[PDB]
Amino acid sequence: VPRGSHMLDPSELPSALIGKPFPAFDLPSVQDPARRLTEADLKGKPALVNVWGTWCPSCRVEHPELTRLAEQGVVIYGINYKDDNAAAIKWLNELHNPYLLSISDADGTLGLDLGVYGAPETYLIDKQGIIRHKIVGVVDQKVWREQLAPLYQQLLD
C-alpha cells in the first residue's frame, strides 16, 4: 500500500516552542478528578515534562530511565495523554511513579498546544515554565547525557 509525502505541521517540530511559556491549561490530576492543575503548578524548578500513555509500548520501555533521573533530583511532571484513566492510575501505582505531578490530558487539548503527536515526548522547562528543549521519542542515558543534561545543568546554575 503506497503512501505519499506527509509533512508534520510546524507546531510538532522540537524547535516550535523553544523560548516560549508552557501553554496555559486547566486539567484534572490523574489520581483525583476533583484536584485541578494549571501551568502555574509547573513553575519553581527546572524540570522535565513527559507525555505518556498506557497505550504506548515506548513509555513502558522509558519508565526506568525516568525513575533513574528522579533519583538524582530531577523534577519530572507527567502529562497522561489521550489515555484510559483507570489504566493510567494502575500504571502509576504498580510501577515506581517518577512524577511529581500527573496531569490528565484525556482529550489531548494540552498536547494540541504542545504539538504532541505520539509518545513519549519530553520537554525541558526552566524555573519560570519557559520551554527550553523538546525530545521526540524515548529518553535513554545517552539522550539525557548529550541532549538534555548540559542544558539542564545551565538552568540549575
PDB file of all heavy atoms in Angstrom, residues 25-59:
ATOM      1  N   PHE A  25      -3.149  25.785  30.778  1.00  0.00           N
ATOM      2  CA  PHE A  25      -4.129  24.707  30.836  1.00  0.00           C
ATOM      3  C   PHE A  25      -4.823  24.692  32.198  1.00  0.00           C
ATOM      4  O   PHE A  25      -4.334  25.272  33.163  1.00  0.00           O
ATOM      5  CB  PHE A  25      -3.489  23.322  30.501  1.00  0.00           C
ATOM      6  CG  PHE A  25      -2.472  22.867  31.510  1.00  0.00           C
ATOM      7  CD1 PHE A  25      -2.852  22.077  32.609  1.00  0.00           C
ATOM      8  CD2 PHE A  25      -1.155  23.253  31.389  1.00  0.00           C
ATOM      9  CE1 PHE A  25      -1.897  21.691  33.570  1.00  0.00           C
ATOM     10  CE2 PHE A  25      -0.198  22.875  32.321  1.00  0.00           C
ATOM     11  CZ  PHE A  25      -0.576  22.084  33.433  1.00  0.00           C
ATOM     12  N   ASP A  26      -5.962  24.021  32.253  1.00  0.00           N
ATOM     13  CA  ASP A  26      -6.660  23.753  33.498  1.00  0.00           C
ATOM     14  C   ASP A  26      -7.246  22.362  33.360  1.00  0.00           C
ATOM     15  O   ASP A  26      -8.271  22.159  32.685  1.00  0.00           O
ATOM     16  CB  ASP A  26      -7.760  24.801  33.767  1.00  0.00           C
ATOM     17  CG  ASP A  26      -8.380  24.655  35.154  1.00  0.00           C
ATOM     18  OD1 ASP A  26      -8.479  23.516  35.663  1.00  0.00           O
ATOM     19  OD2 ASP A  26      -8.767  25.693  35.752  1.00  0.00           O
ATOM     20  N   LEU A  27      -6.584  21.391  33.995  1.00  0.00           N
ATOM     21  CA  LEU A  27      -6.912  19.987  33.788  1.00  0.00           C
ATOM     22  C   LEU A  27      -6.911  19.205  35.105  1.00  0.00           C
ATOM     23  O   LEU A  27      -6.181  19.575  36.024  1.00  0.00           O
ATOM     24  CB  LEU A  27      -5.861  19.350  32.850  1.00  0.00           C
ATOM     25  CG  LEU A  27      -5.864  19.850  31.404  1.00  0.00           C
ATOM     26  CD1 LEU A  27      -4.588  19.356  30.719  1.00  0.00           C
ATOM     27  CD2 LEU A  27      -7.112  19.319  30.728  1.00  0.00           C
ATOM     28  N   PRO A  28      -7.695  18.122  35.182  1.00  0.00           N
ATOM     29  CA  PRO A  28      -7.739  17.325  36.405  1.00  0.00           C
ATOM     30  C   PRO A  28      -6.449  16.541  36.586  1.00  0.00           C
ATOM     31  O   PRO A  28      -5.798  16.170  35.600  1.00  0.00           O
ATOM     32  CB  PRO A  28      -8.894  16.345  36.156  1.00  0.00           C
ATOM     33  CG  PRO A  28      -9.004  16.246  34.661  1.00  0.00           C
ATOM     34  CD  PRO A  28      -8.590  17.576  34.130  1.00  0.00           C
ATOM     35  N   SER A  29      -6.104  16.246  37.832  1.00  0.00           N
ATOM     36  CA  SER A  29      -4.992  15.320  38.093  1.00  0.00           C
ATOM     37  C   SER A  29      -5.427  13.890  37.730  1.00  0.00           C
ATOM     38  O   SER A  29      -6.634  13.582  37.631  1.00  0.00           O
ATOM     39  CB  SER A  29      -4.561  15.382  39.556  1.00  0.00           C
ATOM     40  OG  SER A  29      -5.488  14.662  40.351  1.00  0.00           O
ATOM     41  N   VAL A  30      -4.460  13.013  37.496  1.00  0.00           N
ATOM     42  CA  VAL A  30      -4.796  11.628  37.137  1.00  0.00           C
ATOM     43  C   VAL A  30      -5.461  10.876  38.284  1.00  0.00           C
ATOM     44  O   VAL A  30      -6.445  10.166  38.062  1.00  0.00           O
ATOM     45  CB  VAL A  30      -3.548  10.856  36.636  1.00  0.00           C
ATOM     46  CG1 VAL A  30      -3.841   9.342  36.509  1.00  0.00           C
ATOM     47  CG2 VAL A  30      -3.177  11.401  35.254  1.00  0.00           C
ATOM     48  N   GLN A  31      -4.912  11.029  39.491  1.00  0.00           N
ATOM     49  CA  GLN A  31      -5.392  10.254  40.640  1.00  0.00           C
ATOM     50  C   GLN A  31      -6.675  10.804  41.268  1.00  0.00           C
ATOM     51  O   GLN A  31      -7.380  10.070  41.983  1.00  0.00           O
ATOM     52  CB  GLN A  31      -4.298  10.067  41.692  1.00  0.00           C
ATOM     53  CG  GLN A  31      -3.409  11.271  41.915  1.00  0.00           C
ATOM     54  CD  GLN A  31      -2.370  11.465  40.799  1.00  0.00           C
ATOM     55  OE1 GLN A  31      -2.366  12.481  40.145  1.00  0.00           O
ATOM     56  NE2 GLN A  31      -1.494  10.482  40.602  1.00  0.00           N
ATOM     57  N   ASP A  32      -7.006  12.065  40.976  1.00  0.00           N
ATOM     58  CA  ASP A  32      -8.198  12.683  41.593  1.00  0.00           C
ATOM     59  C   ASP A  32      -8.819  13.719  40.669  1.00  0.00           C
ATOM     60  O   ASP A  32      -8.279  14.807  40.529  1.00  0.00           O
ATOM     61  CB  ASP A  32      -7.814  13.306  42.939  1.00  0.00           C
ATOM     62  CG  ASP A  32      -9.019  13.906  43.679  1.00  0.00           C
ATOM     63  OD1 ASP A  32     -10.152  13.895  43.129  1.00  0.00           O
ATOM     64  OD2 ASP A  32      -8.800  14.396  44.801  1.00  0.00           O
ATOM     65  N   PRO A  33      -9.972  13.400  40.061  1.00  0.00           N
ATOM     66  CA  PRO A  33     -10.548  14.310  39.067  1.00  0.00           C
ATOM     67  C   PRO A  33     -11.028  15.637  39.679  1.00  0.00           C
ATOM     68  O   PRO A  33     -11.277  16.596  38.953  1.00  0.00           O
ATOM     69  CB  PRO A  33     -11.707  13.496  38.485  1.00  0.00           C
ATOM     70  CG  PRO A  33     -12.125  12.586  39.606  1.00  0.00           C
ATOM     71  CD  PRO A  33     -10.813  12.207  40.273  1.00  0.00           C
ATOM     72  N   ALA A  34     -11.130  15.692  41.012  1.00  0.00           N
ATOM     73  CA  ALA A  34     -11.546  16.909  41.719  1.00  0.00           C
ATOM     74  C   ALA A  34     -10.381  17.825  42.063  1.00  0.00           C
ATOM     75  O   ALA A  34     -10.596  18.963  42.514  1.00  0.00           O
ATOM     76  CB  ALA A  34     -12.358  16.555  42.992  1.00  0.00           C
ATOM     77  N   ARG A  35      -9.150  17.342  41.861  1.00  0.00           N
ATOM     78  CA  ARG A  35      -7.963  18.165  42.039  1.00  0.00           C
ATOM     79  C   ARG A  35      -7.534  18.729  40.682  1.00  0.00           C
ATOM     80  O   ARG A  35      -7.154  17.962  39.792  1.00  0.00           O
ATOM     81  CB  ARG A  35      -6.832  17.327  42.633  1.00  0.00           C
ATOM     82  CG  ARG A  35      -5.573  18.117  42.953  1.00  0.00           C
ATOM     83  CD  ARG A  35      -4.383  17.183  43.054  1.00  0.00           C
ATOM     84  NE  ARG A  35      -4.518  16.209  44.137  1.00  0.00           N
ATOM     85  CZ  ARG A  35      -4.012  14.974  44.115  1.00  0.00           C
ATOM     86  NH1 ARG A  35      -3.340  14.519  43.055  1.00  0.00           N
ATOM     87  NH2 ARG A  35      -4.179  14.181  45.156  1.00  0.00           N
ATOM     88  N   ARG A  36      -7.607  20.056  40.517  1.00  0.00           N
ATOM     89  CA  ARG A  36      -7.231  20.672  39.233  1.00  0.00           C
ATOM     90  C   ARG A  36      -5.787  21.165  39.237  1.00  0.00           C
ATOM     91  O   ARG A  36      -5.292  21.660  40.250  1.00  0.00           O
ATOM     92  CB  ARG A  36      -8.145  21.845  38.881  1.00  0.00           C
ATOM     93  CG  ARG A  36      -9.640  21.648  39.140  1.00  0.00           C
ATOM     94  CD  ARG A  36     -10.283  20.758  38.112  1.00  0.00           C
ATOM     95  NE  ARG A  36     -10.081  21.219  36.730  1.00  0.00           N
ATOM     96  CZ  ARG A  36     -10.662  20.649  35.681  1.00  0.00           C
ATOM     97  NH1 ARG A  36     -11.496  19.637  35.862  1.00  0.00           N
ATOM     98  NH2 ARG A  36     -10.420  21.094  34.456  1.00  0.00           N
ATOM     99  N   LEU A  37      -5.114  21.034  38.093  1.00  0.00           N
ATOM    100  CA  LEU A  37      -3.756  21.529  37.934  1.00  0.00           C
ATOM    101  C   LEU A  37      -3.761  22.546  36.795  1.00  0.00           C
ATOM    102  O   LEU A  37      -4.574  22.428  35.881  1.00  0.00           O
ATOM    103  CB  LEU A  37      -2.816  20.377  37.583  1.00  0.00           C
ATOM    104  CG  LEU A  37      -2.813  19.246  38.614  1.00  0.00           C
ATOM    105  CD1 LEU A  37      -2.145  17.965  38.063  1.00  0.00           C
ATOM    106  CD2 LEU A  37      -2.127  19.725  39.885  1.00  0.00           C
ATOM    107  N   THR A  38      -2.877  23.536  36.876  1.00  0.00           N
ATOM    108  CA  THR A  38      -2.662  24.511  35.790  1.00  0.00           C
ATOM    109  C   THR A  38      -1.175  24.667  35.511  1.00  0.00           C
ATOM    110  O   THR A  38      -0.337  24.093  36.223  1.00  0.00           O
ATOM    111  CB  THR A  38      -3.225  25.918  36.140  1.00  0.00           C
ATOM    112  OG1 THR A  38      -2.365  26.554  37.107  1.00  0.00           O
ATOM    113  CG2 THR A  38      -4.665  25.835  36.635  1.00  0.00           C
ATOM    114  N   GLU A  39      -0.826  25.478  34.505  1.00  0.00           N
ATOM    115  CA  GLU A  39       0.584  25.711  34.168  1.00  0.00           C
ATOM    116  C   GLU A  39       1.340  26.392  35.309  1.00  0.00           C
ATOM    117  O   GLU A  39       2.546  26.308  35.379  1.00  0.00           O
ATOM    118  CB  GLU A  39       0.726  26.502  32.850  1.00  0.00           C
ATOM    119  CG  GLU A  39       0.413  28.014  32.964  1.00  0.00           C
ATOM    120  CD  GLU A  39      -1.064  28.337  33.084  1.00  0.00           C
ATOM    121  OE1 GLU A  39      -1.934  27.448  32.981  1.00  0.00           O
ATOM    122  OE2 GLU A  39      -1.375  29.531  33.282  1.00  0.00           O
ATOM    123  N   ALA A  40       0.618  27.050  36.215  1.00  0.00           N
ATOM    124  CA  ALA A  40       1.233  27.636  37.424  1.00  0.00           C
ATOM    125  C   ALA A  40       1.938  26.576  38.291  1.00  0.00           C
ATOM    126  O   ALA A  40       2.989  26.827  38.879  1.00  0.00           O
ATOM    127  CB  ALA A  40       0.174  28.384  38.238  1.00  0.00           C
ATOM    128  N   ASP A  41       1.353  25.381  38.350  1.00  0.00           N
ATOM    129  CA  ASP A  41       1.897  24.291  39.151  1.00  0.00           C
ATOM    130  C   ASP A  41       3.213  23.743  38.612  1.00  0.00           C
ATOM    131  O   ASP A  41       3.881  22.961  39.279  1.00  0.00           O
ATOM    132  CB  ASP A  41       0.869  23.162  39.245  1.00  0.00           C
ATOM    133  CG  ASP A  41      -0.353  23.560  40.020  1.00  0.00           C
ATOM    134  OD1 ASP A  41      -0.196  23.921  41.199  1.00  0.00           O
ATOM    135  OD2 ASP A  41      -1.465  23.509  39.460  1.00  0.00           O
ATOM    136  N   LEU A  42       3.557  24.129  37.389  1.00  0.00           N
ATOM    137  CA  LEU A  42       4.798  23.665  36.763  1.00  0.00           C
ATOM    138  C   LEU A  42       6.005  24.555  37.049  1.00  0.00           C
ATOM    139  O   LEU A  42       7.125  24.209  36.681  1.00  0.00           O
ATOM    140  CB  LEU A  42       4.613  23.524  35.248  1.00  0.00           C
ATOM    141  CG  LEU A  42       3.518  22.559  34.793  1.00  0.00           C
ATOM    142  CD1 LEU A  42       3.617  22.410  33.261  1.00  0.00           C
ATOM    143  CD2 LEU A  42       3.573  21.211  35.481  1.00  0.00           C
ATOM    144  N   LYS A  43       5.780  25.675  37.728  1.00  0.00           N
ATOM    145  CA  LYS A  43       6.826  26.681  37.926  1.00  0.00           C
ATOM    146  C   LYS A  43       7.557  26.479  39.245  1.00  0.00           C
ATOM    147  O   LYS A  43       6.971  25.972  40.214  1.00  0.00           O
ATOM    148  CB  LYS A  43       6.220  28.090  37.885  1.00  0.00           C
ATOM    149  CG  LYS A  43       5.538  28.447  36.546  1.00  0.00           C
ATOM    150  CD  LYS A  43       5.052  29.898  36.534  1.00  0.00           C
ATOM    151  CE  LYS A  43       4.629  30.340  35.120  1.00  0.00           C
ATOM    152  NZ  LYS A  43       3.449  31.236  35.152  1.00  0.00           N
ATOM    153  N   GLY A  44       8.824  26.882  39.284  1.00  0.00           N
ATOM    154  CA  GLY A  44       9.617  26.837  40.507  1.00  0.00           C
ATOM    155  C   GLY A  44      11.004  26.262  40.343  1.00  0.00           C
ATOM    156  O   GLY A  44      11.965  26.770  40.930  1.00  0.00           O
ATOM    157  N   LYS A  45      11.128  25.191  39.551  1.00  0.00           N
ATOM    158  CA  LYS A  45      12.397  24.484  39.405  1.00  0.00           C
ATOM    159  C   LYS A  45      12.562  24.067  37.945  1.00  0.00           C
ATOM    160  O   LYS A  45      11.551  23.799  37.286  1.00  0.00           O
ATOM    161  CB  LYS A  45      12.433  23.231  40.308  1.00  0.00           C
ATOM    162  CG  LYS A  45      12.385  23.532  41.820  1.00  0.00           C
ATOM    163  CD  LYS A  45      12.500  22.282  42.670  1.00  0.00           C
ATOM    164  CE  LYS A  45      12.354  22.618  44.165  1.00  0.00           C
ATOM    165  NZ  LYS A  45      12.202  21.382  45.000  1.00  0.00           N
ATOM    166  N   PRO A  46      13.816  23.987  37.446  1.00  0.00           N
ATOM    167  CA  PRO A  46      13.982  23.410  36.097  1.00  0.00           C
ATOM    168  C   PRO A  46      13.470  21.979  36.144  1.00  0.00           C
ATOM    169  O   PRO A  46      13.658  21.298  37.154  1.00  0.00           O
ATOM    170  CB  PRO A  46      15.496  23.400  35.870  1.00  0.00           C
ATOM    171  CG  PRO A  46      16.096  24.247  36.946  1.00  0.00           C
ATOM    172  CD  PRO A  46      15.110  24.326  38.079  1.00  0.00           C
ATOM    173  N   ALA A  47      12.815  21.526  35.079  1.00  0.00           N
ATOM    174  CA  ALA A  47      12.072  20.250  35.153  1.00  0.00           C
ATOM    175  C   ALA A  47      11.912  19.629  33.777  1.00  0.00           C
ATOM    176  O   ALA A  47      12.083  20.306  32.753  1.00  0.00           O
ATOM    177  CB  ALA A  47      10.684  20.469  35.768  1.00  0.00           C
ATOM    178  N   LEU A  48      11.574  18.343  33.769  1.00  0.00           N
ATOM    179  CA  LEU A  48      11.151  17.677  32.536  1.00  0.00           C
ATOM    180  C   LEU A  48       9.642  17.561  32.577  1.00  0.00           C
ATOM    181  O   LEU A  48       9.063  17.360  33.648  1.00  0.00           O
ATOM    182  CB  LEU A  48      11.779  16.286  32.420  1.00  0.00           C
ATOM    183  CG  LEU A  48      13.306  16.214  32.432  1.00  0.00           C
ATOM    184  CD1 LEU A  48      13.757  14.782  32.235  1.00  0.00           C
ATOM    185  CD2 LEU A  48      13.887  17.139  31.321  1.00  0.00           C
ATOM    186  N   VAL A  49       9.001  17.703  31.424  1.00  0.00           N
ATOM    187  CA  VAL A  49       7.581  17.428  31.285  1.00  0.00           C
ATOM    188  C   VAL A  49       7.451  16.297  30.257  1.00  0.00           C
ATOM    189  O   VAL A  49       7.802  16.488  29.089  1.00  0.00           O
ATOM    190  CB  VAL A  49       6.773  18.658  30.815  1.00  0.00           C
ATOM    191  CG1 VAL A  49       5.293  18.304  30.771  1.00  0.00           C
ATOM    192  CG2 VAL A  49       6.995  19.850  31.752  1.00  0.00           C
ATOM    193  N   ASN A  50       6.978  15.142  30.720  1.00  0.00           N
ATOM    194  CA  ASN A  50       6.996  13.891  29.940  1.00  0.00           C
ATOM    195  C   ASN A  50       5.557  13.508  29.597  1.00  0.00           C
ATOM    196  O   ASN A  50       4.685  13.391  30.489  1.00  0.00           O
ATOM    197  CB  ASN A  50       7.693  12.804  30.764  1.00  0.00           C
ATOM    198  CG  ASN A  50       7.734  11.443  30.064  1.00  0.00           C
ATOM    199  OD1 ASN A  50       6.973  10.539  30.409  1.00  0.00           O
ATOM    200  ND2 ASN A  50       8.650  11.290  29.101  1.00  0.00           N
ATOM    201  N   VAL A  51       5.304  13.330  28.301  1.00  0.00           N
ATOM    202  CA  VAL A  51       3.991  12.986  27.755  1.00  0.00           C
ATOM    203  C   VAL A  51       3.983  11.485  27.583  1.00  0.00           C
ATOM    204  O   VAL A  51       4.880  10.936  26.926  1.00  0.00           O
ATOM    205  CB  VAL A  51       3.815  13.645  26.362  1.00  0.00           C
ATOM    206  CG1 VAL A  51       2.456  13.295  25.721  1.00  0.00           C
ATOM    207  CG2 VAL A  51       3.978  15.142  26.490  1.00  0.00           C
ATOM    208  N   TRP A  52       2.990  10.822  28.175  1.00  0.00           N
ATOM    209  CA  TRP A  52       2.959   9.350  28.185  1.00  0.00           C
ATOM    210  C   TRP A  52       1.542   8.815  28.123  1.00  0.00           C
ATOM    211  O   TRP A  52       0.560   9.568  28.324  1.00  0.00           O
ATOM    212  CB  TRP A  52       3.662   8.851  29.444  1.00  0.00           C
ATOM    213  CG  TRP A  52       2.913   9.190  30.714  1.00  0.00           C
ATOM    214  CD1 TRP A  52       2.931  10.385  31.389  1.00  0.00           C
ATOM    215  CD2 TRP A  52       2.044   8.320  31.453  1.00  0.00           C
ATOM    216  NE1 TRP A  52       2.117  10.311  32.521  1.00  0.00           N
ATOM    217  CE2 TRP A  52       1.574   9.053  32.586  1.00  0.00           C
ATOM    218  CE3 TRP A  52       1.634   6.987  31.289  1.00  0.00           C
ATOM    219  CZ2 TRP A  52       0.711   8.492  33.539  1.00  0.00           C
ATOM    220  CZ3 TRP A  52       0.769   6.428  32.246  1.00  0.00           C
ATOM    221  CH2 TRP A  52       0.323   7.181  33.349  1.00  0.00           C
ATOM    222  N   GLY A  53       1.420   7.514  27.861  1.00  0.00           N
ATOM    223  CA  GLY A  53       0.118   6.846  27.895  1.00  0.00           C
ATOM    224  C   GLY A  53       0.330   5.349  28.057  1.00  0.00           C
ATOM    225  O   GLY A  53       1.344   4.822  27.611  1.00  0.00           O
ATOM    226  N   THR A  54      -0.623   4.663  28.697  1.00  0.00           N
ATOM    227  CA  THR A  54      -0.571   3.189  28.848  1.00  0.00           C
ATOM    228  C   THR A  54      -0.712   2.461  27.503  1.00  0.00           C
ATOM    229  O   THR A  54      -0.389   1.266  27.407  1.00  0.00           O
ATOM    230  CB  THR A  54      -1.681   2.661  29.818  1.00  0.00           C
ATOM    231  OG1 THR A  54      -2.973   2.810  29.205  1.00  0.00           O
ATOM    232  CG2 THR A  54      -1.604   3.415  31.152  1.00  0.00           C
ATOM    233  N   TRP A  55      -1.192   3.182  26.491  1.00  0.00           N
ATOM    234  CA  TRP A  55      -1.333   2.663  25.113  1.00  0.00           C
ATOM    235  C   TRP A  55       0.026   2.592  24.397  1.00  0.00           C
ATOM    236  O   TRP A  55       0.112   2.095  23.274  1.00  0.00           O
ATOM    237  CB  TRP A  55      -2.300   3.550  24.296  1.00  0.00           C
ATOM    238  CG  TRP A  55      -2.003   5.056  24.399  1.00  0.00           C
ATOM    239  CD1 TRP A  55      -2.641   5.961  25.200  1.00  0.00           C
ATOM    240  CD2 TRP A  55      -1.027   5.797  23.661  1.00  0.00           C
ATOM    241  NE1 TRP A  55      -2.104   7.223  25.018  1.00  0.00           N
ATOM    242  CE2 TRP A  55      -1.107   7.149  24.089  1.00  0.00           C
ATOM    243  CE3 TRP A  55      -0.075   5.451  22.684  1.00  0.00           C
ATOM    244  CZ2 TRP A  55      -0.270   8.164  23.573  1.00  0.00           C
ATOM    245  CZ3 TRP A  55       0.745   6.451  22.167  1.00  0.00           C
ATOM    246  CH2 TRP A  55       0.658   7.788  22.621  1.00  0.00           C
ATOM    247  N   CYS A  56       1.067   3.126  25.034  1.00  0.00           N
ATOM    248  CA  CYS A  56       2.350   3.381  24.401  1.00  0.00           C
ATOM    249  C   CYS A  56       3.461   2.429  24.890  1.00  0.00           C
ATOM    250  O   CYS A  56       4.035   2.628  25.969  1.00  0.00           O
ATOM    251  CB  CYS A  56       2.776   4.823  24.691  1.00  0.00           C
ATOM    252  SG  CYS A  56       4.336   5.263  23.849  1.00  0.00           S
ATOM    253  N   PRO A  57       3.793   1.397  24.090  1.00  0.00           N
ATOM    254  CA  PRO A  57       4.879   0.495  24.474  1.00  0.00           C
ATOM    255  C   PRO A  57       6.223   1.199  24.754  1.00  0.00           C
ATOM    256  O   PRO A  57       6.970   0.792  25.647  1.00  0.00           O
ATOM    257  CB  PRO A  57       4.970  -0.469  23.268  1.00  0.00           C
ATOM    258  CG  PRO A  57       3.613  -0.475  22.712  1.00  0.00           C
ATOM    259  CD  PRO A  57       3.150   0.970  22.834  1.00  0.00           C
ATOM    260  N   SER A  58       6.535   2.255  24.002  1.00  0.00           N
ATOM    261  CA  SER A  58       7.765   3.021  24.243  1.00  0.00           C
ATOM    262  C   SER A  58       7.837   3.677  25.615  1.00  0.00           C
ATOM    263  O   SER A  58       8.933   3.897  26.149  1.00  0.00           O
ATOM    264  CB  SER A  58       7.957   4.061  23.146  1.00  0.00           C
ATOM    265  OG  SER A  58       8.165   3.393  21.919  1.00  0.00           O
ATOM    266  N   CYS A  59       6.671   4.017  26.177  1.00  0.00           N
ATOM    267  CA  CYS A  59       6.630   4.580  27.533  1.00  0.00           C
ATOM    268  C   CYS A  59       6.958   3.508  28.562  1.00  0.00           C
ATOM    269  O   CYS A  59       7.603   3.786  29.569  1.00  0.00           O
ATOM    270  CB  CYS A  59       5.258   5.196  27.821  1.00  0.00           C
ATOM    271  SG  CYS A  59       4.862   6.566  26.780  1.00  0.00           S
TER     272      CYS A  59
END
